[PDB]
Design a protein around this ligand. Sequence first.
Ligand code: JAY
Length: 150
Amino acid sequence: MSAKDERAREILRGFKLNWMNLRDAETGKILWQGTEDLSVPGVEHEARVPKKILKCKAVSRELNFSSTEQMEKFRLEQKVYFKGQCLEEWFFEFGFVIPNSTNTWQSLISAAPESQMMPASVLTGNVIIETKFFDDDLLVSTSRVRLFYV
Ligand SMILES: O=C1c2ccccc2N[C@@H](c2ccccc2F)N1CCN1CCC(N2C(=O)c3ccccc3N[C@H]2c2ccccc2F)CC1
């Protein structure tokens, strides 16, 4: 139990994801929206998204979160897993977070252009999104969401 460990736990303790949405980056239409805290580690969350998301060249994410703790460089690493294999990875950087703030973070998620999507029916229930929450190099948490394409 190091000092860094204790700090990671403190951040996790003060962190909350309050809401999120996903929109087609071309049309701006809403594909998903929710208030479930999908960041909570240690349980498999489940979400249903319309299969048309798989035709989007990019997805626009809007994510609202609160943190009692100050963070120097809040960032995420996210991986798409299909039957346990990684098909795609993203890095997003929020940066500095004021202690006891609530913040809305906008991100653009690009589909890898050199891949071809498997169909929805094959993907559905077989895809896990693993999100790791970091402050700089400190791992705060790792959560998973299984996706159904509906
Ligand atoms: O389903 C595929 C896919 C399937 C097979 C091969 C590649 C894929 N890549 C992407 C994708 C598909 C189309 C266009 C762009 C894309 F990025 N996707 C869409 C998944 N994508 C990346 C994960 C995104 N995500 C979040 O950003 C997120 C933020 C905080 C906490 C958990 C998160 N997990 C997911 C997420 C967000 C909202 C609802 C469910 C969900 F799982 C939601 C959008």
